[PDB]
Design a protein around this ligand. Structure first.
Ligand SMILES: [Mg+2]
Ligand SMILES: [Mg+2]
Ligand SMILES: [Mg+2]
Ligand SMILES: [Mg+2]
Lengths: 104, 49, 434, 434, 434, 434, 145
């Protein structure tokens, strides 16, 4: 993810709701396991330590993500997800079908 | 690991936008410009032939 | 801002040339902490064990790459995300992640390194001294040092069964003066040994190992060195012993065999005879401390020794208690010893170290923060001693930076505290009557 | 933000139990630097002299309180207000404030402590590694260690005139491997000396001083230790010497009297015979370095030794040049030696240290950053060696944190550099031919 | 805040009117760095080649749109996310991404532009001068300028085979005075050429290319200008030559044919005759440096020239070494030349440029940082010369700003250095004797 | 944070090797601006005069140490404390402090350097491009360049009285295309002169000064170069003249004696004959611009010339108006000329430069921002031309960075503007019918 | 800090009591700009036309809810992301988004309100007077009324 970053409000919410202090651990099949067997499996190589845990849940429907910015050639700030992009949209696909009995 | 949180997520596939020339106007199939169909949806009309 | 974002361990060397590890903790705002682990023991039934590679090709089986990988792969994923000031939470999470009583899965060295690095990173984030962060606002007491000056037992070929002889400058006004007295007595002893023709090279803890005629000869030479520096034995400087009596203990016959170190003609002593010998040494010389005067399993001997000498002599359990809360509680209940030697790597975590220190203090015991044979440039045990107001430290002799670093840190702490700084000296032996 | 707000010195202990000083520098933004000074010499004809108290009732006249007061009451007022990144300006100001060629008014220790503290505080302010600040962006060469392993001369009572024997693991792929090789050879030599009944307790630099029959006995035992560790002499590990011939040199007889250390039956050799003896040793053993092979005043002998052996063995001048730029320039002009031993406290500042290093490099000589007999926990010389890309360091044995701290810092530097880290080994000896 | 966020490239013009590229680098916090590339050579067996579009419709085939697209599309996505202070890592990543020994895939111009832009952005982020970032704290030496005065060979219609004549004001006290002396001698020579009827229009590097009666006439006129400005030839100002003997060397007959540039009556010399002619020129004039005295493939002749004149005259290998590590190593081992001309776009990376500079320095060679014939308003080579303390620079004559920009940058650097700045002059020719 | 804290001037060389000054302005938050002054003239009745030392022993009396001292000792103390964005206030304060109409007390160079440095520091503080700060948000028009391709008159020994011939690529779609066309025509003319046998070395502004037969021969060769590059004269590229008619005007007999430059066979023309000659040149060749076609003091001749040719060609007053709003007012009132050449150093400040540009624009006149003979790496006139939407620039030929720097800055501005950027070309000559 | 994050239009009244619209622009650092549009003409051969509701029940057909909805639902998503000092780019993007020479699709009033609000927010972000931002450093002449 380069077009976006973690929002500061979500980071603060995760910080002092203390969700990182209540991690859950999973094995290679994604089944919940205690930290002791997670450590055992990671040491023996039967678990990938990277993608095998979760940071509980942040309460409150907060947006996880904000747009990330960059510098233009003018030295101005600009969102990374906006720009020249491309140009191919056509108009639509008008499929006629002026006979369907539309229910009220 | 793939925990179901609350009632879950909405399944929204991507397929090209199509507009039907129904005899009421021009009805676009979706209400979003990111081309998001509700995967698995259909409509039906049942008659007694 | 205080959220841990990086935990990284790397394998370094120790003061004896043997591998150990160091851990670095980085938080979100850039606070940094580094913890180095003194080398301990990978074997032992009732103490925390360290994790060694065992590969004889690399470092003679003493590599610490396994524990470095345990920190980098197991501990790092769990700990990254915690608040750096959550020392107790991080330590309990590491203990639960290990799952064994002896911390043998992750390694006690790994857990202790992460614990020290987290404590130092939290102190750096708070912009406060480490002793202030560990012990609170009321950190004022500078420990009375027990400076090892002569080595015997297994560390010397002389006919001496006592492992260490120490000088305790408890008559000094400040810690700075105590350090000066210790250094001057060290140099006076060096001059005396040079005149005597004995070897003057230092050992693992920085002290000499000369070829004396016996224990009495070594103690008399120490007293001569004390008087040559211009200080009074029994008033300014006292003498401590580390007998390490478990080494020359014949467990099968329940007897203390001095013949192992003091030659074939050495006397053989039972528990009562050993108590009588220690009492005779206490009466003859200004001995204020005796460490491991009995075996680690001679509980009745420990009880009898404390009943006979505990009112006037500090009796320290090093192998007796092994920094174990259970063993210390059993000794407190059975009136065995009146002091405990505290080694942070024998327990594996700062939280449990402070728990053991608090348990010892609440029972009238003194907690003596100690070093190991292989140390580092890490001087955290000085901050532990000042933070707990323990009043006593045992960090070696006056001759190697693995020992001098702790004394330098104590000098820095005393300079920081200024007028607040206190040196009790003889008053730090509160376990003794009067 | 980077303006120096506080300069404060205090008196601490060195690795030998003797006092030295340390200086702390604080800037406006809170950047911090601490520099600890190694113990040098208070006497010298053309070397920077440190300031000692001379109070025989305090530390035997080796106190550093006068230099502490010089930093706190003279240097601090002059330096506070400077930009912390103005290292050259601060060092020039301190040199002008001392006003004497040998830095005797303020003390070379005081000036060096302030220089090191300022450099470290500037690196802390910039949030860059110290070697990056000192040597710029292109700092990648990990120095080839020249590890002292056996002591002779005045450092031991054995019949050996030479002062140091060292192992140079120039055949290793990385610095980590070179350190592991050096530690394993150290332990193999320890085992061999234990088997032979020789003493193992280490000296000032951490090496052994056993009772050998002579120089050849010590070199052969080192070769046996190298082979016991599992390495080829002359391919993986080489041998270096520190003869320190100025100790056994008769000035008026113009002879190198080996009888001072090797008994009455030793060989009293002229300068020419000393050249043939060194050539015999080089042709017999895998010797790649000789340090102080001639007297500090035997300029003709040094020129003849460089003519005879300067193309195959590195010839280092320690007392020959005493890190003096004038002596180094004269030696370059007269084709005497091909390497200089750099000691930061024998010159006074970091600016002049780097000037001497660059002058030696520009003349084809090798700069070897070196320790002192009394060291500290400060490991700035490792950062100096990496920053200048000197490719060689002489920081002691593998047995005391006074020496192991520099090796640990070099391990940290290599880990930080990662894929750009370079260990050159025999390629670091660019003063040699093929 | 130091993470490289944006890497833009664009096509600009050089001093000759031919296209080149420039690269701008923005980091996360807004630190900015712009690097322009001097025009180089797209052909060469053992030098880094630049990428030209080859479209004869645009700029005569010399456009740089392909390399600009390489930076904008290929290099930018690889570099974005790096730390701006990780210059060695960025340079190694660009070299690996090119995957070619001569950097022919991406183009040496593209890689060099990104390297310069990254270094300048890192210096801007750290708020330090560029020479301080590149060379560390010990950057003080202002280079001695060998500035072009008269042209010949292929740059002029005169009957002179030597490509360039230069004045070196090595007797000046400071760089400011050296620049003033060079400007005044330039104007005095302009007046002398005007009074003689010769044309005073300048060439690509800013120097005159008049028609003379030979090399002797040119050196005589330069000496006359030096005296007319008021300075002593041989004490204040010295003469340097750039023969470019590869232009008038016939490889088949192995002779240096001056008939290519001096007419039908010119003399044809062998290697020995050429060395004799250079020796007579040195003994007749105050010539201190000769560049490309022999052909780039004449290793024996180069070795003989260094044997004869290499002790008292600087011998610079421009096409001999082509700023190549392998050629420099071979020349050092073979005792060929005693100086290397360093052109930053001959390798395409600052890391390799500094590696070549240190390799030349460690062998007793001097590194002369050199301009290109098509230069820009970028003045980074001045900061390169100061950062490495090379002590010699070669940036053209005293006319077009593509030369004056570097002199203005050196004036700025000297002004910032203040009392620290050193102008060694004749002492920067350390590769010579006395 | 925008308060000016430091104003510092230093002496640096220009593109001709002659001294000038540069001023650095530092604000409280660290915003930095540098202004480099082009070399003007210290004489002139109604022209702002630069301050030179007159020390004939230093730079031939052309040193600028006095103006540097004026900035450092007089201007800086008055300006420090101002807001950096108060450009008009700072400029008027400096004008009032100087106190003379011609800015002779402090020197126009000092005033201009401080004005440019303050403007660039204000642009740096606001983090906006310099043209955006100078001209607002509606800055889009890239100027149409008049590239000086051939020289003459006092800049050449050929018998041509007209000082400069220029190419105007007014038919290009973008500025990038116009610059490419100009560079290709420059190289085509270089090839044509090389194959014809004439001179190639560039002059003060990068153009050629070959040995032509006259004005018609030079214009025909320029047309041949335009056609050989592949463009259409009169539709893609046009001709422009800088006659410098005040050089060969004799005020005694009120004639234009071409015999001064074109030999004894030249024609001496009255004002009517001069207008007839210019009109026949305009009819013969695609000449769109004539600069200084009449003497600076021939107002009736200027009015008649504007009556005859002012509808179809652009008549520029360079020495007529002397960037003086008084002379411009007069000329606008009496319908003399239709353009003004704006030389920023002929007036002294940016505020008065923009006042002159706005007065010229309000009268239907075009303002051509021009270079000087001694230029620098400073490229502020490009930002001035874009910021005012002047639509025309005169910044030299295509062969020296002193000229290429402004073209490179214009390329940067076009790249930065992107699709907003406009190149009017022929539409930028809004002073002409059709 | 300088990037437009919020563009909100609302319907207000003018000096004659007829409706018009105003646009508020908020950037990331909190810079704020408000632009009110004068009431013009919705008909013209070669002039920009404002967009009215035509609902004769509300304000006699002179409502401006259509232009407000155009700013809130069309212009705002297109403009959010730009730098607030990119006035020329924002105006050209709005002109292209409308697509008609007379600006009749989005309405000239909507585009003018966004333009004025963006310029005012850019002057507020730079902490400079609006005339200084619009005309540069050399703005000194007070107009003759
Ligand atoms: Mg013990
Ligand atoms: Mg030595
Ligand atoms: Mg060349
Ligand atoms: Mg003119």
């Amino acid at each position: 993810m380069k077009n976006f970053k973690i929002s500061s409000t979500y980071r603060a919410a995760r910080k002092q709701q203390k969700t990182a202090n209540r991690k859950s651990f999973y094995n290679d099949e994604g089944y919940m396991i205690s930290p002791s067997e997670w450590a055992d499996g990671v040491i023996k190589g039967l678990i990938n330590p990277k993608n095998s845990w979760s940071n509980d849940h942040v309460k409150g429907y907060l947006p996880r993500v904000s747009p990330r910015s960059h510098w233009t050639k003018n030295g101005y700030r600009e969102y990374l997800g906006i720009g020249k992009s491309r140009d191919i949209p056509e108009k639509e696909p008008e499929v006629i079908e002026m006979m369907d009995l539309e229910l009220v | 690991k793939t925990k179901m949180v609350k009632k879950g997520v909405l399944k929204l596939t991507k397929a090209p936008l199509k507009i039907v020339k129904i005899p009421s106007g021009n009805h676009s199939l979706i209400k979003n410009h990111e081309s998001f169909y509700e995967m698995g949806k259909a409509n039906f009309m049942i008659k007694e032939i | 801002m205080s959220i841990i974002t990086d935990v990284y361990a790397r394998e370094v060397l120790d003061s004896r040339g043997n591998p150990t590890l160091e851990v670095e903790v980085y938080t979100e705002s850039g606070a940094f902490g580094r913890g180095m682990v003194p080398s301990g023991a990978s074997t032992g039934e009732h103490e925390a064990v360290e994790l060694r590679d065992g590969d004889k090709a690399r470092y003679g089986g003493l590599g610490t790459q396994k524990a470095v990988d345990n920190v980098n792969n197991v501990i790092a994923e769990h700990i990254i995300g915690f608040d750096v000031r959550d020392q107790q939470g991080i330590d309990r999470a590491m203990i639960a992640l290990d799952g064994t009583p002896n911390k043998g899965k992750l390694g006690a060295n790994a857990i202790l390194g992460v614990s020290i690095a987290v404590a130092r990173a939290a102190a750096d984030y708070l912009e406060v001294p480490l002793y202030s962060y560990l012990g609170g606002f009321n950190t004022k007491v500078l420990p009375t040092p027990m400076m090892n000056i002569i080595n015997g037992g297994s560390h010397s070929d002389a006919p001496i069964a006592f492992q260490e002889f120490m000088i305790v400058p408890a008559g000094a006004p400040t810690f700075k003066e105590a350090l000066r007295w210790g250094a001057e007595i060290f140099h006076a002893l060096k001059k005396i040994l040079k005149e005597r023709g004995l070897e003057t090279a230092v050992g693992d803890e920085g002290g000499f190992a000369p070829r004396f005629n016996g224990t009495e000869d070594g103690v008399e030479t120490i007293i001569k060195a004390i008087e040559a520096a211009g200080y009074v034995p029994g008033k300014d400087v006292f003498i401590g012993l580390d007998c390490a009596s478990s080494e020359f203990y014949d467990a099968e016959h329940k007897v203390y065999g001095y013949t192992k170190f003091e030659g074939e003609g050495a006397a053989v002593r039972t528990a009562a005879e050993q108590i009588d010998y220690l009492e005779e040494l206490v009466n003859k010389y200004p001995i204020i401390t005796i460490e491991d005067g009995m075996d680690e399993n001679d509980w009745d001997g420990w009880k009898a020794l404390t009943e006979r000498l505990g009112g006037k002599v500090q009796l320290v359990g090093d192998d007796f208690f092994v920094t174990n809360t259970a063993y210390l509680e059993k000794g407190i209940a059975e009136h065995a010893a009146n002091s405990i030697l505290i080694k942070v790597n024998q327990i594996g975590t700062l939280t449990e170290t402070f728990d053991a220190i608090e348990m010892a203090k609440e029972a009238g015991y003194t907690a003596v923060v100690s070093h190991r044979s292989g140390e580092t440039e890490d001087s955290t045990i000085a901050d532990i001693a000042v933070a707990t107001n323990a009043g006593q430290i045992k960090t070696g002799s006056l001759s190697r930076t693995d020992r001098i670093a702790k004394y330098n840190q104590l000098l820095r702490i005393e300079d920081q505290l200024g007028e607040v700084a206190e040196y009790r000296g003889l008053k730090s032996f509160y376990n003794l009557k009067k």
